[PDB]
């Protein structure tokens, strides 16, 4: 079981840096939307300005 | 406009009632999404 003990860690011993260690799991940097591209934000400055009074709204992709 | 009414000895209201449209629209898309827009009609309540 010694024969594996992958001789670079043991060379940094107690001073590992970050790309010796597991990580948690984890996307990429995808950036933000735009919320003007929200699809209940433009029309929510409209039909009120239209003349409506406006309340109610549809749950999001968790429900919630 | 303006009205000219007989005087009474204590002062009174003058209920005037302008006659408007009040319609309500109501949808359920999703379970538990209830959605409502009222539209009152010439005398809207919900300008910008």
Redesign the interface.
């Known amino acids: 079981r010694e024969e594996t003990v992958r001789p670079d860690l043991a060379a940094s011993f107690n001073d590992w840096t970050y790309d010796q260690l597991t990580q948690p799991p984890g996307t990429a940097y995808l950036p933000a939307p735009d919320p003007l591209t929200g699809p209940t934000t433009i029309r929510d400055?409209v039909?009120?300005?239209?003349?409506?009074?406006?309340?109610?709204?549809?749950?999001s992709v968790l429900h919630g | 406009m303006q009205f000219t009414v007989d005087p009474m000895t204590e002062p009174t209201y003058l209920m005037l009632l302008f006659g408007v449209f009040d319609q309500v629209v109501i949808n359920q898309p999703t379970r538990s999404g209830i959605s409502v827009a009222y539209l009152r009609l010439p005398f809207a309540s919900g300008s910008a």
């Open positions: 400055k039909l009120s300005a239209e003349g409506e009074q406006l309340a109610g709204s549809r749950p």
